[PDB]
Write a protein that binds this ligand. Sequence first.
Ligand SMILES: COc1ccc2c3c(n(CC=C(C)C)c2c1)[C@H](C=C(C)C)N1C(=O)[C@@H]2CCCN2C(=O)[C@]1(O)[C@H]3O
Ligand SMILES: COc1ccc2c3c(n(CC=C(C)C)c2c1)[C@H](C=C(C)C)N1C(=O)[C@@H]2CCCN2C(=O)[C@]1(O)[C@H]3O
Ligand SMILES: O=C(O)CCC(=O)C(=O)O
Ligand SMILES: O=C(O)CCC(=O)C(=O)O
Ligand SMILES: [Fe+2]
Ligand SMILES: [Fe+2]
Ligand SMILES: [Fe+2]
Ligand SMILES: [Fe+2]
Lengths: 284, 284
Amino acid sequence: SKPQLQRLAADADVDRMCRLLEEDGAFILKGLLPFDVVESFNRELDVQMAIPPPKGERLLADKYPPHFKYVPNVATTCPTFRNTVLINPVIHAICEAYFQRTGDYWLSAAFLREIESGMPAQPFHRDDATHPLMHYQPLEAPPVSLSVIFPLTEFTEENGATEVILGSHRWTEVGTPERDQAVLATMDPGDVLIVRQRVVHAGGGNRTTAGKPRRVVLAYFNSVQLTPFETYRTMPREMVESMTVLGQRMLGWRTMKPSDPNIVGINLIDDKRLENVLQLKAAD
Amino acid sequence: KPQLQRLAADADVDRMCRLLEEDGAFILKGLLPFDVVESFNRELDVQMAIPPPKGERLLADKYPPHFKYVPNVATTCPTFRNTVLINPVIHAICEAYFQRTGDYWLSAAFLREIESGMPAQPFHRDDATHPLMHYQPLEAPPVSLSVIFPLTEFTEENGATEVILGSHRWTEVGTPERDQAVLATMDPGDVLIVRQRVVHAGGGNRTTAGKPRRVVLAYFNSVQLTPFETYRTMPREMVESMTVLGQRMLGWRTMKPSDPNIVGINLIDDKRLENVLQLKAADS
Ligand SMILES: COc1ccc2c3c(n(CC=C(C)C)c2c1)[C@H](C=C(C)C)N1C(=O)[C@@H]2CCCN2C(=O)[C@]1(O)[C@H]3O
Ligand SMILES: COc1ccc2c3c(n(CC=C(C)C)c2c1)[C@H](C=C(C)C)N1C(=O)[C@@H]2CCCN2C(=O)[C@]1(O)[C@H]3O
Ligand SMILES: O=C(O)CCC(=O)C(=O)O
Ligand SMILES: O=C(O)CCC(=O)C(=O)O
Ligand SMILES: [Fe+2]
Ligand SMILES: [Fe+2]
Ligand SMILES: [Fe+2]
Ligand SMILES: [Fe+2]
């Protein structure tokens, strides 16, 4: 069939990863997270899936059909995400290389979707739609967003493995593509799918019959020039201070630095660093 | 040589918009009443009497001592927070200008005070806070607007803001000569509005009489862009003393970029930030 997503081992060099992002728009890393990390993350998500459901307004969940179960802002309820996944050194090597031209990056959102048996596919989209200015950024400009997609169960053809349209970052418009234009990110738990800015993709339908839910966590990174979709500003101080410096930087708790010509920074207060005004301690 | 156009405070916003598109800037005459200018100046006097810290100053430490700098004006100046920041003409302009991008908020508000003997500021675009703006096409929805308040007279001799008309049509700032600019000579109560991508600079103060020149920048950005200054450490008591509009400007509420983002930005728990915080407001 069509050209497929390229798979690389977790120890591959970041240069080939970048080449794949520019050429295909996406690639898969095999075996990045160990089994115990996946297990611990799933255990923490199980708790969030089991507490009483939210009542009142749900800004995203109320608007879209009930074709997924949603745990927003997993960093606030899943220590394995904050302490291990969010600070993974390979993910940050990729981010540092990819965001080199734009400067610092941070976490715009990270959430779980759980797709039960019988749910149809998600509409094709670009994650870029969070910040519509990205639609007008030329392809050659410094990228400002990156999607990091973690399978927490197997992703199969039957259960709706993420569908990615390779090369669709070269399109001006998303349009209305057919599902057969995409290829499948079939993966095992512990793998990761990395998707460039402007690449059209979607969760697939779960065609299993009963009781076989697919779990996916998206960690959406943006240039610090872009406002985080999720604000981590209500995290308690003791939780923030239990993170490493890198974790605090990702979650918006520190002053950050866009590329030159901004030599001053962003997310400042009183001409000082946010973490200094707050006297933030950190685990490291 | 074409000069900045001056308009009365009751001019139609459509004329203001035409001037921003053609010239890149215009002046409104007599927007703020005498008592508002006076109280704002007295509030800034309080801050100007505080000696600067000898700790880190992220902006002030990097540039020559050719200005005195008071950041965080929305916190320390109630006349700004309660009156200037919510001015209906300013918001009518912002609503027209930011129509295509969606919601906007306050990225920074600061004072510069320039005493006799200080030379001119380098030419710049305020856009340099968020370098992605350099790559945005001229016809794309604007994402930044500079609102410049004279708190003293601005004259040729005291260093009235210099604006290069039409420079938003240049790709690069380049190295323009001072004589390419025209002067925003103004009296307190006026305002200078400067479009995204327009090259401008404060002038030198060559006088030997009169108060040091005072200028306040209120820098507005699309909510897609991270505020240069964060107001997240403002005490809840002070936040709740503001109107809803003021809270929205200072980053304390969930906001709405344009379609195709139908969910929002600056949210948490899939809910509006102000609902999670149970924020009261002066006009709620
Ligand atoms: C959490 O599960 C979902 C369930 C549905 C959607 C949809 C989109 N996203 C991504 C959201 C992020 C915060 C990364 C979704 C995430 C996504 C929306 C955004 C803000 C990126 N979207 C779209 O962009 C396009 C825009 C036109 C219709 N679209 C959709 O229906 C849709 O796929 C919609 O189903
Ligand atoms: C508050 O007083 C100052 C004193 C100096 C500068 C300079 C710039 N700005 C604007 C800052 C904002 C937060 C709106 C300044 C503001 C401005 C910097 C930024 C981040 C917009 N700048 C520049 O962009 C260019 C970039 C190249 C050299 N430049 C300068 O020296 C300079 O004018 C520099 O003097
Ligand atoms: O469900 C998936 O595999 C992809 C989800 C996704 O792309 C999203 O929610 O932004
Ligand atoms: O000093 C002035 O009149 C202009 C100041 C300015 O443009 C800035 O600091 O961004
Ligand atoms: Fe997505
Ligand atoms: Fe098949
Ligand atoms: Fe400026
Ligand atoms: Fe003179």
